[PDB]
PDB file of C-alpha atoms and ligand atoms in Angstrom:
ATOM      1  CA  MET A  15      -0.018   0.149  -0.008  1.00 37.59           C
ATOM      2  CA  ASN A  16       2.866   2.438   1.115  1.00 39.83           C
ATOM      3  CA  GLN A  17       5.899  -0.155   0.148  1.00 36.87           C
ATOM      4  CA  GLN A  18       5.623  -2.309  -2.371  1.00 39.40           C
ATOM      5  CA  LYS A  19       9.080  -2.291  -4.210  1.00 37.91           C
ATOM      6  CA  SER A  20      12.283  -2.018  -2.705  1.00 39.41           C
ATOM      7  CA  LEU A  21      14.508   1.287  -2.803  1.00 41.20           C
ATOM      8  CA  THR A  22      17.719   1.686  -4.577  1.00 42.20           C
ATOM      9  CA  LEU A  23      19.878   4.761  -3.916  1.00 37.92           C
ATOM     10  CA  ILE A  24      22.609   5.809  -6.376  1.00 41.25           C
ATOM     11  CA  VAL A  25      25.552   7.940  -5.503  1.00 39.56           C
ATOM     12  CA  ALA A  26      29.167   8.979  -6.400  1.00 38.61           C
ATOM     13  CA  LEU A  27      31.302   9.505  -3.588  1.00 41.23           C
ATOM     14  CA  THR A  28      35.011   9.872  -2.692  1.00 45.62           C
ATOM     15  CA  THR A  29      36.617   7.227  -0.415  1.00 45.46           C
ATOM     16  CA  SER A  30      36.312   9.791   2.388  1.00 45.36           C
ATOM     17  CA  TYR A  31      32.455   9.780   1.845  1.00 43.24           C
ATOM     18  CA  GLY A  32      32.118  13.430   0.295  1.00 42.58           C
ATOM     19  CA  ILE A  33      29.230  13.885  -2.169  1.00 39.24           C
ATOM     20  CA  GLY A  34      29.279  17.838  -2.763  1.00 36.02           C
ATOM     21  CA  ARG A  35      30.809  21.129  -2.342  1.00 36.85           C
ATOM     22  CA  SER A  36      28.850  24.472  -3.052  1.00 40.47           C
ATOM     23  CA  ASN A  37      25.767  22.885  -3.666  1.00 38.72           C
ATOM     24  CA  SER A  38      27.420  21.507  -6.592  1.00 38.97           C
ATOM     25  CA  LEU A  39      29.348  18.199  -7.616  1.00 40.54           C
ATOM     26  CA  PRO A  40      33.043  18.819  -6.863  1.00 37.48           C
ATOM     27  CA  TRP A  41      33.545  17.003 -10.240  1.00 39.64           C
ATOM     28  CA  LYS A  42      32.830  17.000 -13.909  1.00 39.36           C
ATOM     29  CA  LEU A  43      32.420  13.246 -15.033  1.00 38.52           C
ATOM     30  CA  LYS A  44      30.705  12.907 -18.732  1.00 39.50           C
ATOM     31  CA  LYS A  45      31.051   8.900 -18.246  1.00 37.55           C
ATOM     32  CA  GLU A  46      29.824   8.960 -14.862  1.00 42.25           C
ATOM     33  CA  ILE A  47      26.741  10.949 -15.756  1.00 47.17           C
ATOM     34  CA  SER A  48      25.998   8.581 -18.807  1.00 45.03           C
ATOM     35  CA  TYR A  49      26.091   5.765 -16.294  1.00 41.39           C
ATOM     36  CA  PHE A  50      23.597   7.652 -14.211  1.00 43.38           C
ATOM     37  CA  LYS A  51      21.332   8.170 -17.466  1.00 42.39           C
ATOM     38  CA  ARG A  52      21.631   4.539 -18.161  1.00 42.17           C
ATOM     39  CA  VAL A  53      21.223   2.851 -15.060  1.00 43.61           C
ATOM     40  CA  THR A  54      17.978   4.974 -13.934  1.00 45.32           C
ATOM     41  CA  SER A  55      16.340   5.090 -17.446  1.00 46.21           C
ATOM     42  CA  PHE A  56      16.543   1.227 -18.157  1.00 44.18           C
ATOM     43  CA  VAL A  57      13.587  -1.015 -18.139  1.00 47.63           C
ATOM     44  CA  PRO A  58      13.403  -4.203 -19.803  1.00 44.04           C
ATOM     45  CA  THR A  59      12.396  -4.135 -23.472  1.00 42.52           C
ATOM     46  CA  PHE A  60       9.251  -6.388 -23.149  1.00 40.75           C
ATOM     47  CA  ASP A  61       8.073  -4.083 -20.286  1.00 42.47           C
ATOM     48  CA  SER A  62       9.505  -0.879 -22.048  1.00 42.68           C
ATOM     49  CA  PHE A  63       5.928  -0.790 -23.298  1.00 44.42           C
ATOM     50  CA  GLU A  64       4.094   0.209 -19.893  1.00 45.70           C
ATOM     51  CA  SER A  65       6.959   1.003 -17.276  1.00 46.18           C
ATOM     52  CA  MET A  66       8.974   3.785 -16.390  1.00 44.71           C
ATOM     53  CA  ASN A  67      11.655   4.012 -13.262  1.00 46.52           C
ATOM     54  CA  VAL A  68      11.252   6.614 -10.648  1.00 43.44           C
ATOM     55  CA  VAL A  69      13.825   9.331  -9.755  1.00 40.95           C
ATOM     56  CA  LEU A  70      13.118  10.895  -6.246  1.00 40.86           C
ATOM     57  CA  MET A  71      15.134  13.842  -5.085  1.00 40.90           C
ATOM     58  CA  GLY A  72      15.197  16.615  -2.643  1.00 37.83           C
ATOM     59  CA  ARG A  73      14.581  20.291  -3.625  1.00 38.77           C
ATOM     60  CA  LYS A  74      18.024  21.324  -3.693  1.00 39.30           C
ATOM     61  CA  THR A  75      19.194  18.470  -6.191  1.00 42.32           C
ATOM     62  CA  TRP A  76      16.277  19.461  -8.390  1.00 38.84           C
ATOM     63  CA  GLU A  77      17.549  23.175  -8.578  1.00 40.67           C
ATOM     64  CA  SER A  78      21.169  22.161  -9.283  1.00 39.44           C
ATOM     65  CA  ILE A  79      20.125  19.826 -12.585  1.00 35.29           C
ATOM     66  CA  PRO A  80      20.972  21.917 -15.640  1.00 33.51           C
ATOM     67  CA  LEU A  81      17.801  23.583 -16.427  1.00 32.48           C
ATOM     68  CA  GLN A  82      18.007  21.970 -19.956  1.00 36.88           C
ATOM     69  CA  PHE A  83      18.080  18.310 -18.531  1.00 35.20           C
ATOM     70  CA  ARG A  84      15.392  18.967 -16.189  1.00 35.39           C
ATOM     71  CA  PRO A  85      12.830  16.933 -15.728  1.00 31.40           C
ATOM     72  CA  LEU A  86      15.045  13.701 -16.158  1.00 31.01           C
ATOM     73  CA  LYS A  87      13.666  12.607 -19.802  1.00 31.21           C
ATOM     74  CA  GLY A  88      11.976   9.018 -19.546  1.00 28.94           C
ATOM     75  CA  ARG A  89      11.788   8.587 -15.906  1.00 28.90           C
ATOM     76  CA  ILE A  90       8.716   9.419 -13.152  1.00 26.76           C
ATOM     77  CA  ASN A  91      10.469  12.639 -11.414  1.00 30.30           C
ATOM     78  CA  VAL A  92       9.642  13.398  -8.176  1.00 30.38           C
ATOM     79  CA  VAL A  93      10.727  16.076  -5.826  1.00 28.02           C
ATOM     80  CA  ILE A  94      10.571  15.901  -2.116  1.00 27.79           C
ATOM     81  CA  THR A  95       9.582  19.107  -0.251  1.00 29.69           C
ATOM     82  CA  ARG A  96       8.238  20.529   2.683  1.00 27.45           C
ATOM     83  CA  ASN A  97       7.609  23.969   1.675  1.00 29.66           C
ATOM     84  CA  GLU A  98       5.568  23.013  -1.635  1.00 30.61           C
ATOM     85  CA  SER A  99       3.040  25.813  -2.275  1.00 28.79           C
ATOM     86  CA  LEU A 100       3.959  26.125  -5.863  1.00 28.50           C
ATOM     87  CA  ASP A 101       6.178  23.347  -7.094  1.00 31.34           C
ATOM     88  CA  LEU A 102       6.787  23.835 -10.717  1.00 28.03           C
ATOM     89  CA  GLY A 103       6.078  21.038 -13.161  1.00 28.70           C
ATOM     90  CA  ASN A 104       3.981  19.667 -15.931  1.00 27.97           C
ATOM     91  CA  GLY A 105       3.241  16.453 -14.283  1.00 29.46           C
ATOM     92  CA  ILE A 106       6.271  16.576 -11.945  1.00 30.63           C
ATOM     93  CA  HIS A 107       5.230  15.511  -8.614  1.00 28.73           C
ATOM     94  CA  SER A 108       6.156  16.795  -5.255  1.00 24.68           C
ATOM     95  CA  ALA A 109       5.778  15.058  -1.952  1.00 25.54           C
ATOM     96  CA  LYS A 110       6.445  16.075   1.834  1.00 25.24           C
ATOM     97  CA  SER A 111       8.561  13.053   2.358  1.00 25.59           C
ATOM     98  CA  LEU A 112       9.347   9.786   1.012  1.00 27.44           C
ATOM     99  CA  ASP A 113       6.700   7.801   2.443  1.00 26.89           C
ATOM    100  CA  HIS A 114       4.247  10.475   0.950  1.00 27.55           C
ATOM    101  CA  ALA A 115       5.893   9.894  -2.174  1.00 24.84           C
ATOM    102  CA  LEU A 116       5.542   6.361  -2.156  1.00 23.53           C
ATOM    103  CA  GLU A 117       1.589   6.480  -1.386  1.00 24.66           C
ATOM    104  CA  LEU A 118       1.251   9.260  -4.131  1.00 22.21           C
ATOM    105  CA  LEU A 119       2.875   7.080  -6.723  1.00 25.89           C
ATOM    106  CA  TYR A 120       1.105   4.046  -5.575  1.00 25.61           C
ATOM    107  CA  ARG A 121      -2.317   6.057  -6.019  1.00 26.25           C
ATOM    108  CA  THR A 122      -1.643   7.564  -9.465  1.00 25.07           C
ATOM    109  CA  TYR A 123       0.456   4.772 -11.188  1.00 25.02           C
ATOM    110  CA  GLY A 124      -2.557   2.217 -10.291  1.00 25.73           C
ATOM    111  CA  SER A 125      -4.121  -0.287 -12.508  1.00 30.06           C
ATOM    112  CA  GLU A 126      -5.963   2.444 -13.907  1.00 27.71           C
ATOM    113  CA  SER A 127      -2.935   4.147 -15.196  1.00 30.28           C
ATOM    114  CA  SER A 128      -1.621   3.173 -18.820  1.00 30.67           C
ATOM    115  CA  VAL A 129       1.753   3.832 -17.047  1.00 33.39           C
ATOM    116  CA  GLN A 130       3.281   1.433 -14.242  1.00 32.80           C
ATOM    117  CA  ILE A 131       6.488   1.775 -12.301  1.00 30.98           C
ATOM    118  CA  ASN A 132       9.344  -0.655 -12.795  1.00 33.70           C
ATOM    119  CA  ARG A 133      12.250   0.654 -10.082  1.00 31.80           C
ATOM    120  CA  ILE A 134      12.610   3.440  -7.559  1.00 33.46           C
ATOM    121  CA  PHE A 135      15.622   5.220  -7.184  1.00 33.89           C
ATOM    122  CA  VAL A 136      16.615   7.833  -4.513  1.00 36.46           C
ATOM    123  CA  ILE A 137      18.961   9.829  -6.405  1.00 36.51           C
ATOM    124  CA  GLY A 138      20.134  12.699  -3.582  1.00 35.48           C
ATOM    125  CA  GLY A 139      20.974  14.779  -1.909  1.00 32.53           C
ATOM    126  CA  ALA A 140      22.592  14.302   1.587  1.00 31.25           C
ATOM    127  CA  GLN A 141      19.299  14.847   3.424  1.00 31.94           C
ATOM    128  CA  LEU A 142      17.338  12.732   1.339  1.00 29.52           C
ATOM    129  CA  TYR A 143      20.330   9.981   1.474  1.00 28.58           C
ATOM    130  CA  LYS A 144      19.867  10.348   5.186  1.00 27.73           C
ATOM    131  CA  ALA A 145      16.006   9.691   5.281  1.00 25.24           C
ATOM    132  CA  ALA A 146      16.469   6.803   2.516  1.00 24.46           C
ATOM    133  CA  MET A 147      19.115   5.168   4.645  1.00 23.45           C
ATOM    134  CA  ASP A 148      16.700   4.795   7.528  1.00 24.99           C
ATOM    135  CA  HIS A 149      13.827   3.454   5.254  1.00 22.94           C
ATOM    136  CA  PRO A 150      12.844  -0.218   5.893  1.00 21.72           C
ATOM    137  CA  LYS A 151      12.771  -0.440   2.276  1.00 23.02           C
ATOM    138  CA  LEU A 152      16.110   0.490   1.008  1.00 21.68           C
ATOM    139  CA  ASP A 153      18.128  -2.672   0.055  1.00 18.51           C
ATOM    140  CA  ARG A 154      20.584  -1.450  -2.687  1.00 15.90           C
ATOM    141  CA  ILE A 155      23.035   1.028  -3.124  1.00 15.68           C
ATOM    142  CA  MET A 156      24.492   1.813  -6.781  1.00 13.60           C
ATOM    143  CA  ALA A 157      27.870   3.503  -5.810  1.00 14.57           C
ATOM    144  CA  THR A 158      30.551   4.991  -7.986  1.00 14.03           C
ATOM    145  CA  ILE A 159      33.790   5.486  -5.968  1.00  9.35           C
ATOM    146  CA  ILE A 160      36.176   8.322  -6.827  1.00 11.83           C
ATOM    147  CA  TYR A 161      39.800   7.772  -5.754  1.00 10.62           C
ATOM    148  CA  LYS A 162      40.725  11.291  -5.153  1.00  7.03           C
ATOM    149  CA  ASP A 163      40.095  13.120  -1.751  1.00 10.46           C
ATOM    150  CA  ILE A 164      38.824  16.257  -3.217  1.00 10.35           C
ATOM    151  CA  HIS A 165      37.424  18.842  -0.827  1.00  9.19           C
ATOM    152  CA  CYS A 166      33.710  18.546  -0.286  1.00  6.41           C
ATOM    153  CA  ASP A 167      31.436  20.007   2.729  1.00  4.75           C
ATOM    154  CA  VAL A 168      28.579  17.447   2.141  1.00  2.00           C
ATOM    155  CA  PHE A 169      28.971  13.843   3.309  1.00  3.26           C
ATOM    156  CA  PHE A 170      27.366  10.586   2.815  1.00  2.00           C
ATOM    157  CA  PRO A 171      25.666   9.524   6.128  1.00  2.00           C
ATOM    158  CA  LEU A 172      26.419   5.957   6.734  1.00  2.62           C
ATOM    159  CA  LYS A 173      30.092   4.423   6.076  1.00  2.00           C
ATOM    160  CA  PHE A 174      28.549   1.543   4.227  1.00  2.00           C
ATOM    161  CA  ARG A 175      31.782   0.405   3.124  1.00  2.00           C
ATOM    162  CA  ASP A 176      33.606   0.314   6.555  1.00  5.17           C
ATOM    163  CA  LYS A 177      34.430  -2.931   8.712  1.00  8.22           C
ATOM    164  CA  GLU A 178      31.516  -1.734  11.272  1.00  9.06           C
ATOM    165  CA  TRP A 179      28.722  -2.291   8.395  1.00  8.19           C
ATOM    166  CA  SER A 180      30.233  -5.449   6.723  1.00  6.98           C
ATOM    167  CA  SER A 181      27.858  -7.948   8.522  1.00  5.56           C
ATOM    168  CA  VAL A 182      24.947  -5.599   6.817  1.00  9.49           C
ATOM    169  CA  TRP A 183      26.241  -4.404   3.791  1.00 10.87           C
ATOM    170  CA  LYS A 184      27.667  -6.943   1.197  1.00  8.20           C
ATOM    171  CA  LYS A 185      29.501  -5.867  -2.081  1.00  8.23           C
ATOM    172  CA  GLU A 186      28.234  -7.997  -4.822  1.00  9.69           C
ATOM    173  CA  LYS A 187      30.296  -9.337  -7.735  1.00  9.01           C
ATOM    174  CA  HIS A 188      30.370  -7.460 -11.088  1.00  4.16           C
ATOM    175  CA  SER A 189      28.901  -9.833 -13.043  1.00  2.00           C
ATOM    176  CA  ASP A 190      25.707  -9.251 -10.778  1.00  2.00           C
ATOM    177  CA  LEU A 191      26.073  -5.572 -11.302  1.00  2.00           C
ATOM    178  CA  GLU A 192      25.771  -5.887 -14.995  1.00  2.00           C
ATOM    179  CA  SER A 193      22.739  -8.465 -14.464  1.00  2.00           C
ATOM    180  CA  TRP A 194      20.675  -5.657 -12.828  1.00  2.00           C
ATOM    181  CA  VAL A 195      21.637  -2.726 -14.806  1.00  2.00           C
ATOM    182  CA  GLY A 196      20.996  -5.022 -17.615  1.00  2.00           C
ATOM    183  CA  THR A 197      23.968  -4.212 -19.524  1.00  2.00           C
ATOM    184  CA  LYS A 198      27.928  -4.724 -19.768  1.00  2.00           C
ATOM    185  CA  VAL A 199      29.606  -2.130 -17.364  1.00  2.00           C
ATOM    186  CA  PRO A 200      33.168  -0.980 -17.162  1.00  2.00           C
ATOM    187  CA  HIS A 201      35.313  -3.334 -14.560  1.00  2.00           C
ATOM    188  CA  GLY A 202      38.097  -1.761 -12.815  1.00  2.00           C
ATOM    189  CA  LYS A 203      38.841   1.645 -12.798  1.00  2.00           C
ATOM    190  CA  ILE A 204      38.046   4.306 -15.333  1.00  2.00           C
ATOM    191  CA  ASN A 205      40.179   7.686 -15.539  1.00  2.00           C
ATOM    192  CA  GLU A 206      38.582  11.053 -16.651  1.00  2.00           C
ATOM    193  CA  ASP A 207      39.693  14.493 -16.379  1.00  2.00           C
ATOM    194  CA  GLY A 208      42.357  13.044 -13.824  1.00  2.00           C
ATOM    195  CA  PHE A 209      39.894  11.183 -11.791  1.00  2.00           C
ATOM    196  CA  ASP A 210      39.954   7.375 -10.962  1.00  2.00           C
ATOM    197  CA  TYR A 211      36.674   5.951 -10.432  1.00  2.00           C
ATOM    198  CA  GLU A 212      34.743   2.587 -10.003  1.00  2.00           C
ATOM    199  CA  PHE A 213      31.243   1.124 -10.070  1.00  2.00           C
ATOM    200  CA  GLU A 214      29.834  -1.052  -7.346  1.00  2.00           C
ATOM    201  CA  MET A 215      26.788  -2.553  -6.067  1.00  2.00           C
ATOM    202  CA  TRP A 216      25.950  -3.295  -2.450  1.00  2.00           C
ATOM    203  CA  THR A 217      23.114  -5.241  -1.221  1.00  2.00           C
ATOM    204  CA  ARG A 218      21.532  -5.851   2.433  1.00  2.00           C
ATOM    205  CA  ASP A 219      19.106  -8.083   3.670  1.00  2.00           C
ATOM    206  CA  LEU A 220      15.890  -6.668   4.993  1.00  2.00           C
TER     207      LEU A 220
HETATM  208  N1  NAP B  18      27.304  13.011  -5.061  1.00  2.00           N
HETATM  209  C1  NAP B  18      26.139  12.714  -5.381  1.00  2.00           C
HETATM  210  O1  NAP B  18      25.881  11.859  -6.057  1.00  2.00           O
HETATM  211  C2  NAP B  18      24.738  13.435  -5.098  1.00  2.00           C
HETATM  212  C3  NAP B  18      23.712  13.371  -5.652  1.00  2.00           C
HETATM  213  C4  NAP B  18      22.443  14.366  -5.329  1.00  2.00           C
HETATM  214  C5  NAP B  18      23.041  15.641  -4.767  1.00  2.00           C
HETATM  215  N2  NAP B  18      24.214  15.839  -4.411  1.00  2.00           N
HETATM  216  C6  NAP B  18      25.021  17.045  -3.668  1.00  2.00           C
HETATM  217  O2  NAP B  18      24.254  17.271  -2.302  1.00  2.00           O
HETATM  218  C7  NAP B  18      24.105  18.565  -1.796  1.00  2.00           C
HETATM  219  C8  NAP B  18      22.831  19.104  -1.720  1.00  2.00           C
HETATM  220  O3  NAP B  18      22.610  18.404  -0.337  1.00  2.00           O
HETATM  221  P1  NAP B  18      21.257  18.761   0.212  1.00  2.00           P
HETATM  222  O4  NAP B  18      21.586  17.840   1.633  1.00  2.00           O
HETATM  223  O5  NAP B  18      21.215  20.053   0.692  1.00  2.00           O
HETATM  224  O6  NAP B  18      20.104  18.488  -0.469  1.00  2.00           O
HETATM  225  P2  NAP B  18      18.859  17.665  -1.072  1.00  2.00           P
HETATM  226  O7  NAP B  18      18.305  16.556  -0.225  1.00  2.00           O
HETATM  227  O8  NAP B  18      18.852  17.620  -2.538  1.00  2.00           O
HETATM  228  O9  NAP B  18      18.123  19.213  -0.911  1.00  2.00           O
HETATM  229  C9  NAP B  18      17.663  19.063   0.648  1.00  2.00           C
HETATM  230  C10 NAP B  18      16.158  19.705   0.437  1.00  2.00           C
HETATM  231  O10 NAP B  18      15.333  18.887   0.212  1.00  2.00           O
HETATM  232  C11 NAP B  18      13.930  18.697   0.841  1.00  2.00           C
HETATM  233  N3  NAP B  18      14.202  17.546   1.728  1.00  2.00           N
HETATM  234  C12 NAP B  18      15.058  16.507   1.637  1.00  2.00           C
HETATM  235  N4  NAP B  18      14.929  15.344   2.431  1.00  2.00           N
HETATM  236  C13 NAP B  18      13.454  15.998   2.894  1.00  2.00           C
HETATM  237  C14 NAP B  18      12.701  15.190   3.941  1.00  2.00           C
HETATM  238  N5  NAP B  18      12.705  14.003   4.371  1.00  2.00           N
HETATM  239  N6  NAP B  18      11.423  15.902   4.200  1.00  2.00           N
HETATM  240  C15 NAP B  18      11.493  17.277   3.553  1.00  2.00           C
HETATM  241  N7  NAP B  18      12.056  17.769   2.805  1.00  2.00           N
HETATM  242  C16 NAP B  18      13.171  17.181   2.653  1.00  2.00           C
HETATM  243  C17 NAP B  18      14.249  19.937   1.855  1.00  2.00           C
HETATM  244  O11 NAP B  18      13.540  20.844   0.929  1.00  2.00           O
HETATM  245  P3  NAP B  18      12.471  22.317   1.131  1.00  2.00           P
HETATM  246  O12 NAP B  18      13.343  23.498   1.491  1.00  2.00           O
HETATM  247  O13 NAP B  18      11.907  22.401  -0.144  1.00  2.00           O
HETATM  248  O14 NAP B  18      11.346  21.930   1.981  1.00  2.00           O
HETATM  249  C18 NAP B  18      15.761  20.223   2.000  1.00  2.00           C
HETATM  250  O15 NAP B  18      16.157  21.603   2.139  1.00  2.00           O
HETATM  251  C19 NAP B  18      25.108  19.327  -2.847  1.00  2.00           C
HETATM  252  O16 NAP B  18      26.489  19.052  -2.744  1.00  2.00           O
HETATM  253  C20 NAP B  18      24.663  18.419  -4.049  1.00  2.00           C
HETATM  254  O17 NAP B  18      25.436  18.690  -5.246  1.00  2.00           O
HETATM  255  C21 NAP B  18      25.503  14.793  -4.651  1.00  2.00           C
HETATM  256  C1  MTX B  19      23.589  17.256  -9.717  1.00  2.00           C
HETATM  257  N1  MTX B  19      23.164  15.853 -10.056  1.00  2.00           N
HETATM  258  C2  MTX B  19      23.035  15.010  -9.128  1.00  2.00           C
HETATM  259  C3  MTX B  19      23.738  13.585  -9.323  1.00  2.00           C
HETATM  260  C4  MTX B  19      24.937  13.668 -10.255  1.00  2.00           C
HETATM  261  N2  MTX B  19      25.410  12.477 -10.537  1.00  2.00           N
HETATM  262  C5  MTX B  19      25.192  11.405 -10.080  1.00  2.00           C
HETATM  263  N3  MTX B  19      25.782  10.204 -10.107  1.00  2.00           N
HETATM  264  C6  MTX B  19      25.741   9.211  -9.560  1.00  2.00           C
HETATM  265  N4  MTX B  19      26.170   8.077  -9.926  1.00  2.00           N
HETATM  266  N5  MTX B  19      24.521   9.005  -8.787  1.00  2.00           N
HETATM  267  C7  MTX B  19      23.586  10.239  -8.434  1.00  2.00           C
HETATM  268  N6  MTX B  19      22.854  10.034  -7.615  1.00  2.00           N
HETATM  269  C8  MTX B  19      24.026  11.478  -8.930  1.00  2.00           C
HETATM  270  N7  MTX B  19      23.270  12.644  -8.764  1.00  2.00           N
HETATM  271  C9  MTX B  19      22.724  15.727 -11.520  1.00  2.00           C
HETATM  272  C10 MTX B  19      23.160  16.594 -12.520  1.00  2.00           C
HETATM  273  C11 MTX B  19      22.863  16.314 -13.846  1.00  2.00           C
HETATM  274  C12 MTX B  19      22.122  15.247 -14.283  1.00  2.00           C
HETATM  275  C13 MTX B  19      21.593  15.049 -15.560  1.00  2.00           C
HETATM  276  O1  MTX B  19      21.822  16.045 -16.307  1.00  2.00           O
HETATM  277  N8  MTX B  19      21.553  14.153 -16.034  1.00  2.00           N
HETATM  278  C14 MTX B  19      21.076  13.610 -17.435  1.00  2.00           C
HETATM  279  C15 MTX B  19      22.378  13.285 -18.315  1.00  2.00           C
HETATM  280  C16 MTX B  19      22.869  14.059 -19.334  1.00  2.00           C
HETATM  281  C17 MTX B  19      24.135  13.512 -20.164  1.00  2.00           C
HETATM  282  O2  MTX B  19      24.340  12.337 -20.377  1.00  2.00           O
HETATM  283  O3  MTX B  19      24.954  14.459 -20.252  1.00  2.00           O
HETATM  284  C18 MTX B  19      20.201  12.423 -17.474  1.00  2.00           C
HETATM  285  O4  MTX B  19      19.492  12.732 -18.261  1.00  2.00           O
HETATM  286  O5  MTX B  19      20.365  11.698 -16.333  1.00  2.00           O
HETATM  287  C19 MTX B  19      21.646  14.436 -13.225  1.00  2.00           C
HETATM  288  C20 MTX B  19      21.921  14.583 -11.740  1.00  2.00           C
END
């Protein structure tokens, strides 16, 4: 009713868990952003008829996305916001929280609907990551790790890759990565504009 699907989080962070700086991305990765697109837009062909995935984001992230690329094309876009008097959108929903966002969707995209949801993604920011991380339906993390310690002022809320969470978070094999995002993905490090990064998939039991 409120929670049918599992939540998936997608983030890019430095080894020190930094995700932002000056309400921006401390970096510029063309291939990192294309993987983003790919992962969150992908829906099985046979189902490519009826379905769309969901991109849930907080207000600030929405404001950061190049206005030329907003709304995210091909995905159900939902902005999380308390102070929502006049959201701006032509069928771009607003919701006062993740749980409210989940019942909104579950109420709009019902059997009535010609449009049905496939997967649901939390794309940021720090603040929504924090709510997602505590949600009882969050079971997968789509993370891109950057091997540079760039200066950030925004950090990811749980050190999911540290020994302390090793009995809860498990890092899946790459072959498993590709099986889920339904495509061959670069393995090992990619270097761009001097940055060395890598794609990983972390799961947890609920
Ligand atoms: N590294 C990455 O992958 C990644 C992805 C996205 C963003 N970022 C970065 O993260 C930073 C922005 O961080 P942020 O924490 O300020 O932004 P954010 O979550 O995008 O925006 C926070 C705003 O969203 C709303 N919000 C979020 N969670 C809410 C909840 N549970 N209930 C109600 N409202 C909620 C509030 O909006 P109202 O004021 O509208 O009520 C709050 O001011 C920047 O560095 C941005 O670049 C990084
Ligand atoms: C600021 N921001 C948040 C952002 C950026 N990179 C991320 N990277 C990952 N891996 N995960 C995230 N959650 C993420 N979030 C952005 C900024 C731009 C676009 C964006 O324009 N995306 C286009 C891609 C355009 C392109 O290929 O050049 C899209 O259609 O998805 C998305 C999110």
